[PDB]
C-alpha cells in the first residue's frame, strides 16, 4: 500500500486516462490497457493497434512479462527484400504493406487484462473511443514526424488520405478508428483477428500485395515469458528477455560496469572517460547481439552463457580504460 498511484505517459491524454482509471478503482493493468488504447488514438506515430510491444509487470509481489511482438507472416522468406542482383531493396522493409508483421497489440492488451484486470473490458476502451470521436490536439513534435513520414513514404501509400490533415494545436478526429475501437470493445480481439477488422486488414493486404492472411491472424498469440532478472547493489531489475535484446544487454552492461568499478571511481558523469568506458562496454554487447540473438523458439540462443558471471568477467577484462579497442578485434564472446 502506497500514498497513491502514479502514471508517467508520453502525452497528456494517456496520463489523464490512466489517472481516471486508477481513481475509478482500476489497478495498474486496467489503467495500462486504457492508456494503451488511448495512445493508439492520440499518439499514432507509435501508439497503435496495428503494431506490437512488450509489457513488464509486478503484481502482488511477483514479476511477469508479456510478449505481444509481431510475427513474420507465414509467406515471409529469408530473401523477400532482396532484388534480382541480391541487393536489399531500399525501404521495402520500411514502407508499404510487405513491411508489416502480424500485429500483436490488441491480443497483448487482452491477455494482460484477462489475467490481472479488475474493470470491464468495454469500459477500458471508452476513453480511447472518446478521443477518436471528439478529437485530440496535435502536438508540435507529432506534426514534425508527420512531415518526415510523408517524405519517406514518397506518395507510395494511403498515409496522406488519413493523416494528411494533422495540424499542430488543431483538433484531429478519426471516425473509422472510433468504430474499430468500438468493435474491439464489444467483441474483444475476435474482431481484430477473426471479425470485421480482420476482414478489412486482409482486404488491404490483397489490394497492396501484402502477405498477411486470415490464417496469420487466427494463429497469432501473445506469449507470457519469464522476465530477465538482474541483481546489483542490492536491487533487482526485471526487464525484457528474448526476443528483446535489451535484457541480455542490460545484464552485460551492468555486470561489466560492476566488474570495472575501479575504473569508474572518481569519474564524473558524461566526462570523456565515462563516455569512453560506456563505449568500450557497448562494443562487446553489440558484438554478441549481432551474432547470437533472435526469436528463442527458432534457434538455441545461448542466453545462460551470455549472462554467466564468469563470462561477464571475461568480457569486462577486455575493456580498455585508456584507449579505444581495435574494432576489428572485438569478437562475439563465444567464438
Amino acid at each position: 500500500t502506497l500514498d497513491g498511484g502514479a502514471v508517467a505517459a508520453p502525452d497528456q491524454y494517456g496520463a489523464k486516462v490512466a489517472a481516471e482509471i486508477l481513481k475509478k478503482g482500476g489497478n495498474a493493468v486496467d489503467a495500462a490497457v486504457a492508456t494503451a488504447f488511448t495512445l493508439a488514438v492520440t499518439y499514432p506515430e507509435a501508439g497503435n493497434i496495428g503494431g506490437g510491444g512488450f509489457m513488464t509487470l509486478y503484481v502482488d509481489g511477483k514479476p511477469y512479462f508479456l510478449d505481444y511482438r509481431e510475427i513474420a507472416p507465414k509467406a515471409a522468406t529469408k530473401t523477400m527484400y532482396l532484388n534480382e542482383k541480391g541487393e536489399v531493396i531500399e525501404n521495402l522493409s520500411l514502407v508499404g504493406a510487405k513491411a508489416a508483421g502480424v500485429p500483436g497489440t490488441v491480443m497483448g492488451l487482452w491477455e494482460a487484462h484477462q489475467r490481472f484486470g479488475k474493470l470491464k473490458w468495454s469500459e477500458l476502451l471508452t476513453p480511447a473511443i472518446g478521443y477518436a470521436q471528439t478529437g485530440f490536439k496535435v502536438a508540435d513534435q507529432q506534426y514534425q514526424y508527420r512531415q518526415d513520414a510523408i517524405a519517406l513514404f514518397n506518395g507510395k501509400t494511403n498515409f496522406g488520405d488519413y493523416f494528411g490533415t494533422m495540424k499542430p494545436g488543431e483538433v484531429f478526429k478519426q471516425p473509422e478508428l472510433a468504430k474499430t475501437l468500438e468493435r474491439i470493445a464489444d467483441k474483444g480481439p475476435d474482431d481484430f483477428y477473426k471479425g470485421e477488422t480482420a476482414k478489412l486488414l486482409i482486404a488491404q493486404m490483397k489490394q497492396d500485395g501484402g502477405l498477411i492472411t486470415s490464417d496469420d491472424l487466427v494463429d497469432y498469440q501473445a506469449k507470457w515469458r519469464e522476465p530477465m532478472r538482474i541483481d546489483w547493489q542490492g536491487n533487482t531489475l526485471y526487464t525484457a528477455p528474448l526476443p528483446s535484446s535489451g535484457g541480455i544487454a542490460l545484464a552485460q552492461l551492468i555486470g561489466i560496469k560492476e566488474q570495472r568499478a575501479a575504473d569508474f571511481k572518481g569519474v564524473e558523469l558524461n566526462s570523456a572517460k565515462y563516455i569512453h568506458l560506456l563505449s568500450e562496454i557497448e562494443k562487446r554487447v553489440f558484438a554478441d547481439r549481432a551474432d547470437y540473438l533472435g526469436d528463442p523458439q527458432f534457434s538455441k540462443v545461448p542466453v545462460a552463457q551470455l549472462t554467466d558471471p564468469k563470462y561477464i568477467a571475461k568480457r569486462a577484462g577486455e575493456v580498455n580504460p585508456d584507449a579505444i579497442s581495435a574494432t576489428e578485434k572485438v569478437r562475439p564472446g563465444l567464438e
Binding site: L2, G4, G5, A6, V7, A8, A9, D11, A19, A28, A31, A32, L39, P44, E45, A46, N48, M55, Y58, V59, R69, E70, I71, K78, V88, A97, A100, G101, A112, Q142, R146, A149, F153, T157, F159, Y162, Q174, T180, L200, Y238, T239, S244, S245, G246, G247, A249, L250, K257, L269, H276, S279, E282, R289, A290, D291, L293, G294, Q297, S299, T327
Partner: protein
C-alpha cells in the same frame, strides 16, 4: 516506439513499451478501420552484415522466417528492492533503448541524481558499428572539452537527428511516489491520490 509507466496504490506496476517501429509505421492505413500497420519487419536482418534503419546488423539468429518474432531493443523495466517496486522506466529509441535505460539507471543509483535530473541528463550511444561512432541528440549535443577529448581518442561524434529517447519513469520512496517525463518529449506524469 513510445513507453509508459504505471504504479497503483497497491504497489502493482506496469511498464509498457510498444511501437509501429518507425514513426507512423509502414504508412499503410487499413481502409475502413483507420489504423496504421507497422513496418516491424525491418528489425529482422534482411541480409547478413547489412545494417537496418537503426544501424544494427545480424546473421542467422535474426534472419526472416515465417511466424518468427523479430529481434527488438525495447526494454520495459521495473526495479525492485525488498520485494517492493522502487523504479519503473522505459523509453523509445530503437537500438538506443537499453543504453539509455542503462545511463538513467547509473544516474539514479551511481550518481544519486534526482529522478528529474537523471532523465534530463545528456545521453550518448555507441554500438560497435558504425566503427567508433558516438551518437548524440540535438537536445544535449556533445560539445566543448568532452567532445574534443573523445575526438582526440579517435571517436567520430554524430548528431543522430532525433532525440535520444523519451524516458517515462516513476520512483517509489517508501510509500511516496514521484514521476519524471523526459524533457525531450511531451510526456506528462501525475501522482493519483486515492
Amino acid at each position: 516506439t513510445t513507453h509508459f509507466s504505471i504504479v497503483d496504490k497497491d504497489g502493482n506496476a506496469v511498464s509498457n513499451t510498444y511501437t509501429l517501429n518507425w514513426d507512423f509505421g509502414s504508412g499503410v492505413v487499413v481502409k475502413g478501420a483507420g489504423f496504421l500497420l507497422n513496418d516491424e519487419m525491418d528489425d529482422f536482418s534482411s541480409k547478413p552484415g547489412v545494417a537496418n534503419a537503426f544501424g544494427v546488423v545480424g546473421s542467422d539468429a535474426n534472419a526472416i522466417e515465417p511466424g518468427k518474432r523479430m529481434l527488438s531493443s525495447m526494454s520495459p523495466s521495473i526495479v525492485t528492492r525488498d520485494g517492493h517496486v522502487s523504479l519503473v522506466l522505459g523509453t523509445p529509441g530503437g537500438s538506443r533503448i537499453f543504453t539509455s535505460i542503462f545511463q538513467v539507471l547509473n544516474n539514479v543509483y551511481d550518481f544519486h541524481l534526482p529522478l528529474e535530473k537523471a532523465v534530463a541528463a545528456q545521453r550518448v550511444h555507441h554500438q560497435l558499428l558504425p566503427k567508433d561512432t558516438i551518437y548524440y541528440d540535438a537536445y544535449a549535443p556533445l560539445t566543448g572539452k568532452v567532445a574534443d577529448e573523445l575526438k582526440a581518442m579517435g571517436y567520430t561524434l554524430e548528431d543522430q537527428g532525433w532525440n535520444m529517447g523519451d524516458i517515462q519513469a516513476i520512483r517509489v520512496n517508501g510509500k511516496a511516489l514521484e514521476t519524471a517525463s523526459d524533457p525531450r518529449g511531451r510526456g506528462v506524469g501525475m501522482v493519483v491520490k486515492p
